[PDB]
Design a protein around this ligand. Sequence first.
Ligand SMILES: CC(=O)NC[C@H]1CN(c2ccc(-c3ccc(CNCc4c[nH]nn4)cc3)c(F)c2)C(=O)O1
Lengths: 215, 121, 121, 113, 50
Amino acid sequence: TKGILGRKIGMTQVFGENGELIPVTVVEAKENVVLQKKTVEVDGYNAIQVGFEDKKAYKKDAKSNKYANKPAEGHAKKADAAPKRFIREFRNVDVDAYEVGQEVSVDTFVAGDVIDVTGVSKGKGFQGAIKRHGQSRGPMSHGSHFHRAPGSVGMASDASRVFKGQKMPGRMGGNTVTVQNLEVVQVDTENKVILVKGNVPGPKKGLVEIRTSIK
Amino acid sequence: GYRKLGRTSDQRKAMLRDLATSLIISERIETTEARAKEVRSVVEKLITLGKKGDLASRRNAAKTLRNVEILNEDETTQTALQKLFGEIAERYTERQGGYTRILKQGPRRGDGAESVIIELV
Amino acid sequence: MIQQETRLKVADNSGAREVLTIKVLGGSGRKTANIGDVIVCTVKNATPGGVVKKGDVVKAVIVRTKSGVRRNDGSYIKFDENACVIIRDDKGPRGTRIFGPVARELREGNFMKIVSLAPEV
Amino acid sequence: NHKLIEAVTKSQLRTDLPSFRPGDTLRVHVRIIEGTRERIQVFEGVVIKRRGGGVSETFTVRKISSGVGVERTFPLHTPKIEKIEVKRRGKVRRAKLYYLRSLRGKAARIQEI
Amino acid sequence: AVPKRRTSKTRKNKRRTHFKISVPGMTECPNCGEYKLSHRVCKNCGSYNG
RNA sequence: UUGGCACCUCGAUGUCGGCUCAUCGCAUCCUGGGGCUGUAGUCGGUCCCAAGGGUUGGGCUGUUCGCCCAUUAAAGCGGUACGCGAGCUGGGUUCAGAACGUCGUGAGACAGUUCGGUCCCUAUCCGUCGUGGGCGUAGGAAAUUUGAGAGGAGCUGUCCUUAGUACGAGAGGACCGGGAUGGACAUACCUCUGGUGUACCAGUUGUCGUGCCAACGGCAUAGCUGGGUAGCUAUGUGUGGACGGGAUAAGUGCUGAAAGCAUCUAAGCAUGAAGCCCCCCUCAAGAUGAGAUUUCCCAACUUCGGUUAUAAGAUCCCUCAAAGAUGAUGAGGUUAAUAGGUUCGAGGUGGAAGCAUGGUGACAUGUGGAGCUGACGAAUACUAAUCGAUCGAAGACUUAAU
Ligand SMILES: CC(=O)NC[C@H]1CN(c2ccc(-c3ccc(CNCc4c[nH]nn4)cc3)c(F)c2)C(=O)O1
């Protein structure tokens, strides 16, 4: 089991050996080090921390998150590394990795071919019941005065209330989803990019998490 | 486009052209904050056509500028197009972009709208 | 063909000229059917030179669709009209001639007689 | 055109194909593996559209088999295509020749340069 | 839909808890000496001079 | 279900079908596990466990019901004011008009038909779907995170192969195991195939204006017509229900007595379901039982035994979008590439203007795949993100262990 982080770049396509189309997502993964290691003695569970993208050093103003503050600056010096945003933990991986900082490259995912990707957001904000839960509309001719509204929300005077878990308008998108059983096309050196079959969640420039498939 | 400014398609092009021809005759006007960010791009693209000087540039600038008689020359009814390509284009012959400066005044009475002042640098 | 009330033209050498779809076989709630699918249809206009008469419930395979079909290598093929061929229970056509071209993928081990009778594949 | 996009795309792009402009007769030699053996089949028609891109660039060819029209779209840099030649050129005044679909006979012909 | 019941002084005064306004957020200009808004000109004698 | 009774409502509790959205029961229609058989096999007929998921489009009728057509693994029966009109419709019945049959001396009535015919309401409280502030968690902060709990998911077909084998006079044709590819449904996404694309490009009609010709602009749905970038999208492109443990129901058992034999049960020991608890996915310490890890900070005054400001940090204001009703969340504020402009590209349109040449002309050909170009990728401080202000600690008492 292994895992890294990266930023979604875009969608492309490659040609197979005999010749076909494979939709491809471009994901760059660079500057991944181990910031901390956790054991069963303290906090009672094994894991490793990873940092993705290094940021600037300590500054006097530091009013735009581009510079690491004092609690984070002193956090990345114990691992002999640089302050890196986007810290995440990987529990499935084995603990055979030095607690001191050591870089993780994309070349470890060679011949993997079975992974899963975690998305961070969708970004819709749409409220309508037709668009959010995929409901049917009403007639548009015939004198109808019911086009895109939700129908009844319960029975009459038997329960005399609305049950929990109804399908009503509200903010949609921007939740954690995970696509399983993808494949790795090719790992490219000197660019630190990974080619994955299909498509990953999230918009461009968004953080993704690639782990070894659990099934 | 960029922002609708609370008008329709044909009304928006008639208003953006009215402010651009006003910033050439007076070089300083008072307006709203949201409309000042839009006319900022309309005038800065007309100064670029004035630095070229070709006949194809004089005709590409006649599609925006209105026909008004600036007396800034003070003689001979100079047009809004003749002030451009002339003294305006000579002032910014070395400057590369950024020929506009906007200053903020405050919320006005009866509207609560941000009054601003936009002028040629 | 694609839906329940689609009008299809019969391409093989039989009395049927235009047919009206009635059902799409394969699973329940099945909505559409592309090239290579068997359907149940009825004869609307018939030719006296043929054996099938007006108002006959028959089966037929789809051979041409205006929508098209996508292949594994990433290429698409699309036709100008819609067409079908009346077949038997064991995939045998009712007619000894096939008119017009035929989609390149019907030799799935079951329609060998149709592709051979086709003039151009 | 992100810089990391062409870095991986540069391995798939081909160059031996000759440049053609929409509205000319094109003779395409396509390899088909249909059946136990493989062989080459020729496709001859007129180029009606060509949308841009990088590796994902396609073109459309339309011909007439017998009274009915046939249209086929191929990716430009596919390995399935073996060779492409330009038999005849034509004079048009637009990039998308969508009006050819409705016409037939003496109206579906294009003048030559 | 009409109100089924009257409104209390307690319920009316709880709803207007957040019905307030804040300080305009002003600073002092070291050219005119008077208070002024941020990122704006001194409304009295002076200018921006950023 | 058709009734019986007349207990609540006549200073109003809106009736039939259909549409949208569901939820519950088991007396089970399909799938899963079994006993018996007048069960050879393939298909069945009965009864016993089992409610996890699934349970289709049309013609006729206002119709419920019912008949019929073509499919399906199957086209289940009921409760919820015969669910649902401050969510929709108004074809039926019970308004004023008119006509037929019939009845009455008549004005008029139906154990009956026919054609028309006003459906109002800005959500106070509980309820539900989203999203912020305040205080708390015995110091004040920045990141990572355990999971007591809670929700989501749960379906199935056709061929191939064991095998033309077991079984059977022949026809006909498997259980049990192993592959391939679909149907419906659910989710992410825009590289392809399409749609849209009102500050992109190009053709063209009538009229007015820039003094005129050339070249442009206003108005007529965006005047009309042919294309189309980013974004948002399905009908398009990927993925998912995988594979296993533990305890059980209906069943089958082993050993074994009460009852010298016998016997699944009383002691004891196994096996055994699409169901139960987990494994897979998401939320989750306001879990007041308020958890854990890592790093950053640490004085001056007081006789109050307690205060004030500052620190770490976080905000006011300002430029923005990967976010968004507002707010919140993210990328940045001159130790600066955050957004405009400028300078080069990608994609889109398809040959600008001027001049030259060839025709009496409308036009055509050259310099030239020219010119133009919103939302996409880079480089560049040229214009704005000035100067300032507010908030925020100095760690309670008792008992054990040192
Ligand atoms: C108008 C109003 O506001 N009423 C307030 C009260 C009264 N009411 C109410 C409502 C509906 C009815 C009612 C329901 C069905 C039928 C059957 N029809 C067919 C038929 C048979 N024979 N002949 N025709 C008749 C009447 C009622 F009997 C009572 C309610 O719900 O509250």
